[PDB]
Coordinates of C-alpha atoms and ligand atoms in Angstrom, one line a residue:
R1 CA 8.1 28.2 51.0
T2 CA 6.9 29.1 54.5
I3 CA 6.4 27.7 58.0
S4 CA 5.4 24.1 58.4
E5 CA 1.7 23.4 59.0
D6 CA 2.8 21.0 61.7
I7 CA 4.2 24.0 63.6
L8 CA 2.3 26.6 65.6
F9 CA 3.7 30.1 65.6
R10 CA 2.3 33.1 67.5
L11 CA 3.4 36.6 68.3
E12 CA 3.6 37.2 72.1
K13 CA 4.3 40.1 74.5
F14 CA 7.9 38.8 74.7
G15 CA 8.4 38.2 71.0
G16 CA 6.9 34.9 69.9
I17 CA 6.4 31.2 70.6
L18 CA 6.9 28.1 68.5
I19 CA 5.2 24.8 69.3
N20 CA 5.2 21.5 67.5
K21 CA 1.6 20.3 66.9
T22 CA 2.8 16.8 67.5
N23 CA 6.0 16.6 69.7
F24 CA 4.7 19.6 71.7
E25 CA 8.3 20.8 72.2
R26 CA 8.5 24.6 72.3
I27 CA 10.9 27.5 71.8
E28 CA 10.6 31.1 73.1
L29 CA 11.5 33.6 70.4
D30 CA 12.6 37.2 70.9
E31 CA 11.2 40.3 69.1
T32 CA 13.7 40.1 66.2
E33 CA 13.2 36.4 65.5
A34 CA 9.4 36.8 66.0
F35 CA 9.1 39.6 63.5
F36 CA 11.4 37.7 61.1
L37 CA 9.4 34.5 61.2
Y38 CA 6.1 36.4 61.1
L39 CA 7.2 37.7 57.7
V40 CA 8.6 34.3 56.8
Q41 CA 5.0 33.0 57.3
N42 CA 3.2 35.7 55.4
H43 CA 5.6 36.5 52.5
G44 CA 7.9 33.6 52.2
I45 CA 11.5 33.2 53.4
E46 CA 12.9 35.5 50.6
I47 CA 11.0 38.7 51.5
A48 CA 11.8 38.0 55.2
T49 CA 15.5 37.9 54.2
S50 CA 15.2 41.3 52.7
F51 CA 14.2 42.8 56.0
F52 CA 16.5 42.1 59.0
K53 CA 19.5 42.1 56.6
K54 CA 21.7 43.8 59.1
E55 CA 20.5 41.3 61.8
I56 CA 21.7 38.3 59.8
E57 CA 25.1 39.9 59.6
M58 CA 25.1 40.4 63.4
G59 CA 24.1 36.8 63.9
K60 CA 20.8 38.0 65.4
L61 CA 18.9 35.5 63.2
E62 CA 21.4 32.6 63.4
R63 CA 19.3 30.5 65.8
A64 CA 16.0 31.3 64.0
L65 CA 17.3 30.0 60.7
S66 CA 18.9 26.9 62.2
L67 CA 15.4 25.7 63.2
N68 CA 13.6 23.0 61.2
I69 CA 10.2 24.7 61.0
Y70 CA 10.1 25.6 57.3
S71 CA 8.2 23.8 54.5
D72 CA 7.1 24.3 50.9
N73 CA 3.7 25.8 49.9
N74 CA 2.0 44.6 51.7
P75 CA 4.9 43.4 53.9
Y76 CA 5.5 46.9 55.3
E77 CA 2.0 47.2 56.8
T78 CA 2.2 43.5 57.7
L79 CA 5.3 44.4 59.8
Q80 CA 3.4 47.4 61.4
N81 CA 0.4 45.2 62.4
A82 CA 2.9 42.9 64.1
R83 CA 4.3 45.8 66.1
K84 CA 0.9 47.1 67.1
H85 CA -0.2 43.6 68.2
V86 CA 2.9 43.0 70.3
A87 CA 2.4 46.4 72.0
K88 CA -1.2 45.6 72.9
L89 CA -0.2 42.3 74.4
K90 CA 2.4 44.1 76.5
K91 CA -0.2 46.6 77.5
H92 CA -2.8 44.0 78.7
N93 CA 0.1 41.8 79.8
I94 CA -1.7 38.6 78.6
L95 CA -0.9 35.7 76.4
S96 CA -2.0 35.9 72.7
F97 CA -4.8 33.4 72.8
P98 CA -5.6 30.2 74.7
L99 CA -3.7 27.1 73.6
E100 CA -6.6 24.9 74.5
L101 CA -10.3 25.5 73.6
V102 CA -12.8 23.3 75.4
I103 CA -16.2 23.0 73.9
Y104 CA -19.4 21.5 75.2
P105 CA -21.8 21.2 72.2
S106 CA -24.3 19.4 74.5
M107 CA -24.5 19.0 78.2
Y108 CA -26.8 15.9 78.1
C109 CA -25.2 12.6 79.0
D110 CA -26.7 9.1 78.8
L111 CA -24.9 8.2 82.1
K112 CA -24.8 9.7 85.6
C113 CA -21.5 8.8 87.3
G114 CA -21.0 9.6 91.0
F115 CA -17.6 11.2 90.5
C116 CA -19.1 13.6 88.0
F117 CA -20.5 17.1 88.7
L118 CA -21.9 17.7 85.2
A119 CA -24.3 14.8 85.4
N120 CA -28.0 15.4 84.7
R121 CA -27.8 18.8 82.9
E122 CA -30.3 18.3 80.2
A123 CA -28.4 22.8 71.8
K124 CA -27.0 24.6 68.8
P125 CA -26.1 23.2 65.4
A126 CA -22.5 22.5 64.2
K127 CA -22.9 25.4 61.8
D128 CA -22.5 27.8 64.7
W129 CA -19.7 25.8 66.4
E130 CA -17.9 25.9 63.0
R131 CA -17.8 29.7 63.2
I132 CA -16.4 29.6 66.8
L133 CA -13.9 27.0 65.5
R134 CA -12.6 29.3 62.8
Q135 CA -11.9 32.1 65.3
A136 CA -9.8 29.8 67.4
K137 CA -8.0 28.4 64.4
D138 CA -7.1 31.8 62.9
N139 CA -6.2 33.2 66.4
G140 CA -3.7 30.5 67.1
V141 CA -5.4 27.8 69.2
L142 CA -3.2 24.8 69.7
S143 CA -5.9 22.2 70.2
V144 CA -9.7 21.8 70.7
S145 CA -11.2 19.4 73.3
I146 CA -14.8 18.3 72.7
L147 CA -16.6 17.4 76.0
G148 CA -20.0 17.5 77.6
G149 CA -22.1 15.7 78.3
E150 CA -21.7 12.8 76.0
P151 CA -20.5 14.5 72.7
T152 CA -21.4 11.4 70.7
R153 CA -25.0 12.0 71.9
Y154 CA -24.8 15.5 70.4
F155 CA -27.0 15.2 67.3
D156 CA -24.8 17.3 65.0
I157 CA -21.6 15.6 66.2
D158 CA -20.7 14.2 62.8
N159 CA -20.8 17.6 61.2
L160 CA -18.8 19.2 64.0
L161 CA -16.2 16.4 63.7
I162 CA -15.9 17.0 60.0
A163 CA -15.5 20.7 60.4
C164 CA -12.6 20.1 62.8
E165 CA -11.0 17.7 60.3
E166 CA -11.4 20.2 57.5
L167 CA -10.1 23.2 59.5
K168 CA -7.1 21.0 60.2
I169 CA -7.3 21.5 64.0
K170 CA -5.7 19.1 66.4
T171 CA -8.8 17.8 68.2
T172 CA -9.8 15.2 70.9
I173 CA -13.2 13.9 71.8
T174 CA -14.1 12.3 75.1
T175 CA -16.8 9.5 75.1
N176 CA -18.2 6.7 77.3
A177 CA -18.6 4.7 74.1
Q178 CA -22.1 3.5 75.1
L179 CA -24.3 4.7 72.2
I180 CA -21.9 5.9 69.6
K181 CA -23.3 5.8 66.0
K182 CA -21.5 3.8 63.3
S183 CA -21.1 7.0 61.2
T184 CA -19.3 8.7 64.0
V185 CA -16.9 5.8 64.6
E186 CA -16.0 5.8 60.9
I187 CA -15.2 9.5 60.8
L188 CA -12.8 9.0 63.8
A189 CA -11.1 5.9 62.3
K190 CA -10.4 7.8 59.1
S191 CA -9.6 11.1 60.8
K192 CA -6.1 12.4 60.9
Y193 CA -6.5 15.2 63.4
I194 CA -9.2 13.9 65.8
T195 CA -8.2 11.5 68.6
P196 CA -10.9 9.7 70.7
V197 CA -10.6 9.5 74.5
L198 CA -12.4 6.7 76.3
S199 CA -13.8 7.2 79.8
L200 CA -13.0 3.9 81.6
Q201 CA -12.5 3.6 85.4
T202 CA -11.6 -0.1 85.5
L203 CA -11.9 -3.5 83.8
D204 CA -13.6 -4.9 86.9
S205 CA -17.3 -5.2 86.0
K206 CA -18.7 -4.6 89.5
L207 CA -16.6 -1.6 90.4
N208 CA -17.0 0.2 87.1
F209 CA -20.8 -0.3 87.3
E210 CA -20.7 1.3 90.8
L211 CA -18.7 4.3 89.4
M212 CA -20.2 4.7 85.9
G213 CA -23.5 2.7 86.1
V214 CA -22.3 0.4 83.2
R215 CA -20.1 -2.6 82.5
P216 CA -16.8 -1.7 80.8
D217 CA -17.6 -3.9 77.8
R218 CA -18.4 -1.3 75.2
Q219 CA -15.3 0.9 76.0
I220 CA -13.1 -2.2 75.8
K221 CA -14.7 -3.1 72.4
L222 CA -14.2 0.3 70.9
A223 CA -10.6 0.4 72.2
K224 CA -9.9 -3.0 70.5
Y225 CA -11.5 -1.8 67.2
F226 CA -9.3 1.3 66.8
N227 CA -6.1 -0.8 67.3
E228 CA -7.3 -2.9 64.4
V229 CA -7.9 0.0 62.0
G230 CA -4.7 1.6 63.2
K231 CA -6.4 4.6 64.8
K232 CA -4.8 6.2 67.8
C233 CA -6.8 5.9 71.0
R234 CA -6.6 7.0 74.6
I235 CA -8.1 6.0 78.0
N236 CA -9.1 8.4 80.7
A237 CA -9.7 7.4 84.4
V238 CA -10.6 9.3 87.6
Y239 CA -8.7 8.1 90.6
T240 CA -11.6 7.4 93.0
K241 CA -11.7 4.0 94.6
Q242 CA -9.4 1.9 92.4
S243 CA -6.6 -0.2 94.1
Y244 CA -3.1 -0.4 92.6
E245 CA -3.9 -3.8 91.3
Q246 CA -6.9 -2.6 89.3
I247 CA -4.8 0.3 87.9
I248 CA -1.9 -2.0 86.7
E249 CA -4.7 -4.2 85.4
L250 CA -5.7 -1.4 83.0
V251 CA -2.0 -0.4 82.2
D252 CA -1.5 -3.9 80.7
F253 CA -4.7 -3.5 78.7
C254 CA -3.3 -0.3 77.1
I255 CA 0.0 -2.1 76.5
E256 CA -1.8 -5.0 74.9
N257 CA -4.0 -2.9 72.6
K258 CA -1.3 -0.3 72.0
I259 CA -3.2 2.7 73.6
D260 CA -1.5 5.9 72.6
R261 CA -1.7 7.5 76.1
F262 CA -3.2 6.6 79.5
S263 CA -4.1 9.3 82.0
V264 CA -5.2 9.1 85.6
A265 CA -7.0 12.3 86.8
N266 CA -7.2 13.4 90.4
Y267 CA -10.6 13.4 92.0
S268 CA -12.2 16.6 93.3
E269 CA -15.5 16.5 95.2
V270 CA -18.1 19.2 94.5
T271 CA -20.5 19.9 97.3
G272 CA -24.0 19.0 96.1
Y273 CA -23.0 17.5 92.7
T274 CA -20.7 14.6 93.6
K275 CA -21.9 11.6 95.6
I276 CA -18.7 9.5 95.8
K277 CA -16.4 10.3 98.7
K278 CA -12.8 11.1 98.0
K279 CA -10.3 8.4 99.2
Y280 CA -7.0 9.6 97.9
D281 CA -5.2 13.0 97.9
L282 CA -2.5 14.5 95.6
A283 CA 0.2 12.8 97.7
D284 CA -1.4 9.4 97.0
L285 CA -1.7 10.3 93.4
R286 CA 2.0 11.0 93.2
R287 CA 2.8 7.5 94.7
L288 CA 0.5 6.0 92.1
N289 CA 2.3 7.7 89.2
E290 CA 5.7 6.7 90.5
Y291 CA 4.2 3.2 90.8
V292 CA 2.8 2.9 87.2
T293 CA 5.8 4.5 85.5
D294 CA 8.1 1.9 87.1
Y295 CA 5.9 -1.0 86.0
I296 CA 5.8 0.3 82.5
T297 CA 9.5 0.9 82.1
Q298 CA 10.3 -2.3 84.0
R299 CA 8.3 -4.0 81.3
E300 CA 9.9 -2.0 78.5
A301 CA 6.5 -0.8 77.3
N302 CA 6.0 2.2 75.0
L303 CA 2.9 3.5 77.0
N304 CA 2.7 7.2 77.4
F305 CA 1.5 7.5 81.0
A306 CA 0.7 10.6 83.1
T307 CA -1.3 11.9 86.0
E308 CA -3.5 15.0 85.6
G309 CA -5.1 17.7 87.7
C310 CA -4.5 21.1 89.3
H311 CA -1.9 21.9 92.0
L312 CA -0.4 18.4 91.6
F313 CA 3.0 20.2 92.3
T314 CA 1.9 20.6 95.9
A315 CA 2.8 17.0 96.5
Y316 CA 6.5 17.6 95.8
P317 CA 8.0 19.5 98.7
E318 CA 11.3 18.5 97.2
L319 CA 10.9 21.4 94.7
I320 CA 10.0 25.0 95.6
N321 CA 13.4 25.8 96.9
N322 CA 12.6 29.5 96.4
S323 CA 15.3 29.6 93.7
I324 CA 13.0 28.7 90.8
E325 CA 13.2 31.5 88.3
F326 CA 10.4 31.2 85.7
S327 CA 10.7 32.5 82.2
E328 CA 8.1 35.1 81.0
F329 CA 6.2 32.3 79.2
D330 CA 6.6 29.6 81.8
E331 CA 5.3 32.0 84.4
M332 CA 1.9 31.9 82.6
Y333 CA 2.0 28.5 81.0
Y334 CA 2.5 26.4 84.2
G335 CA 0.0 26.4 87.1
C336 CA -3.6 27.5 86.8
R337 CA -4.5 27.2 83.1
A338 CA -7.7 29.3 83.4
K339 CA -5.5 32.4 83.5
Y340 CA -3.7 32.5 80.2
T341 CA -3.7 29.1 78.4
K342 CA -7.3 27.9 78.1
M343 CA -10.9 28.8 77.4
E344 CA -14.1 26.9 78.0
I345 CA -17.4 27.4 76.0
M346 CA -20.7 26.1 77.3
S347 CA -23.5 24.7 75.2
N348 CA -25.5 28.0 75.4
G349 CA -22.4 29.9 74.3
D350 CA -21.3 31.2 77.7
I351 CA -17.5 31.7 77.8
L352 CA -15.6 30.6 81.0
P353 CA -12.0 30.6 82.0
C354 CA -12.6 27.2 83.6
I355 CA -15.5 24.7 84.1
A356 CA -15.3 25.6 87.8
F357 CA -16.7 29.0 87.0
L358 CA -20.0 27.3 86.1
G359 CA -21.1 27.5 89.8
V360 CA -20.1 31.2 90.0
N361 CA -22.9 33.7 89.9
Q362 CA -21.5 36.3 87.6
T363 CA -22.6 37.4 84.1
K364 CA -20.7 35.7 81.2
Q365 CA -20.2 36.7 77.6
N366 CA -21.7 34.7 74.7
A367 CA -19.5 33.1 72.0
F368 CA -22.4 32.9 69.5
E369 CA -22.7 36.7 69.6
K370 CA -19.3 38.1 70.5
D371 CA -15.8 37.4 69.2
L372 CA -13.5 35.1 71.2
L373 CA -10.6 37.5 70.9
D374 CA -12.6 40.5 72.2
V375 CA -13.8 38.5 75.2
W376 CA -10.2 37.2 75.7
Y377 CA -9.1 40.8 76.2
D378 CA -11.9 42.6 78.2
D379 CA -13.7 39.8 80.2
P380 CA -14.3 40.5 83.9
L381 CA -14.0 36.8 84.9
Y382 CA -10.5 36.5 83.3
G383 CA -9.4 39.8 84.8
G384 CA -10.6 38.7 88.2
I385 CA -8.5 35.5 88.2
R386 CA -5.6 37.0 86.2
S387 CA -5.1 39.9 88.6
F388 CA -5.8 38.1 91.9
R389 CA -2.9 38.1 94.3
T390 CA -2.6 36.3 97.7
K391 CA -1.4 37.8 100.9
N392 CA -0.8 34.5 102.7
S393 CA 2.5 34.2 104.7
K394 CA 3.4 30.7 103.6
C395 CA 2.5 31.4 99.9
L396 CA 4.5 34.6 99.8
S397 CA 7.5 32.6 101.0
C398 CA 6.8 29.9 98.5
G399 CA 8.7 29.5 95.2
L400 CA 5.6 28.6 93.2
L401 CA 3.6 31.7 94.3
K402 CA 3.5 33.2 90.8
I403 CA 1.8 30.1 89.2
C404 CA -0.4 29.2 92.2
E405 CA -1.3 32.3 94.3
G406 CA -2.6 30.3 97.3
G407 CA -4.5 27.7 95.4
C408 CA -7.5 27.5 93.1
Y409 CA -9.1 31.0 92.6
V410 CA -12.6 29.6 92.4
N411 CA -12.3 28.0 95.9
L412 CA -10.7 31.1 97.5
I413 CA -13.4 33.7 96.4
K414 CA -16.0 31.6 98.3
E415 CA -14.2 32.3 101.5
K416 CA -14.6 35.2 103.9
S417 CA -11.1 36.5 103.2
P418 CA -9.8 35.1 99.8
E419 CA -6.6 37.1 99.9
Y420 CA -5.5 35.4 103.1
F421 CA -7.1 31.9 102.8
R422 CA -4.9 29.1 101.6
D423 CA -6.5 26.2 99.8
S424 CA -6.5 23.0 102.0
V425 CA -5.3 21.1 98.9
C426 CA -1.8 22.4 99.9
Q427 CA -0.5 21.4 103.4
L428 CA 3.0 23.0 103.1
Ligands
SF4_501 S1 -19.7 9.4 81.2 FE1 -18.4 11.3 81.5 S2 -19.9 13.1 81.5 FE2 -21.2 11.2 81.4 S3 -21.7 11.1 83.6 FE3 -19.8 9.9 83.4 S4 -18.1 11.3 83.7 FE4 -20.0 12.6 83.6
SF4_502 S1 -9.6 27.7 88.2 FE1 -9.1 26.1 89.6 S2 -9.8 24.2 88.6 FE2 -9.8 25.8 87.0 S3 -7.6 25.4 86.1 FE3 -7.4 27.0 87.5 S4 -6.8 26.1 89.5 FE4 -7.6 24.4 88.1
SF4_503 S1 -0.9 27.3 98.1 FE1 0.7 28.7 98.7 S2 2.5 27.4 99.6 FE2 1.1 26.0 98.6 S3 1.9 25.6 96.6 FE3 0.5 27.4 96.2 S4 1.6 29.3 96.9 FE4 3.0 27.4 97.4

């Protein structure tokens, strides 16, 4: 009788964290509760009760016990390892492990969209990626995102997908649904942990062809299929040139076919990689989200909708009252994810804090040769972005400084004086 498989538990520099692998609700644990539950996980609730006996009498474990995180299924040196680990995290002052691992088994894509900066990139077997997958699993990764490139075009994709299902890792795969094999679709429809995400900009045939170079027919078909087989599905769109009418048009489609979740990502140009010109900014993206959410609730639709992108909080001057006190975890969870909450691995094995680091000319460590935990500790790229601090007047007066530090790190280092330059994305 230990901790539920549906729950993620990790030791952190401030004790520990609990996260639902479904509801995604979270609770910050202290050192006592963290060590208690760490034993509850490795030696059952009984042996855990033996230790901390005085604590239970002092109500120090009252809250921990009241949690519904338990299921059915040398403790001294196990407790020592816990203490050594927590101390090391305090030393490096980093989070335990990324919560999101993004993998790019292949960079090749059958399409070449204009809002894409990974188009035309032109691979290792799933056996290797399986090894990398185990490290993430055993180190406490919350979810794995499979991208590219068209991952359904990755030859060993079926094996990779199976490995994810077997390792019991919450996983998503993003596809254009153009040339996906029948074997691949079957694995997804019967999968319990893997969730497909469909790249679809609009139902309008003409516009989508301009944006993706294809009609939306095959994405629409695959979306309708999963609703039949009862498999959860998601739609992903980049806010480029769509009008509000074409957006709501796609909202209804998700409502009709019971799409699990619909996301609209902000669009960021990349000089020399993206052909399409940016029409809307983060302010416009906010108005859109406020528009869609009303339409969905005004129709009483159970559609999980959201907007996505970095520095989206810059479009809400209402907040940032300079009174925002962030918890030790929130201070590293919100904002730039490249710092503490995510990792990205390229097709050649190169490890990156973010995909944006691709265009950065600095040596990277290889995942097919070094351990993900070792890199997570001593990597120059992570240390660079983790330790960076802005000296901008407006930023230093800003409430969100800790999670932003004057905008996206990758953009700032390109400037003459990164420490003083504020990203144009923010106009506050
Ligand atoms: S389908 Fe996805 S990866 Fe392929 S070109 Fe378009 S955006 Fe880029
Ligand atoms: S480095 Fe830039 S693009 Fe990457 S997550 Fe952080 S803020 Fe966003
Ligand atoms: S760039 Fe500076 S002012 Fe703008 S949101 Fe980030 S820290 Fe606050």
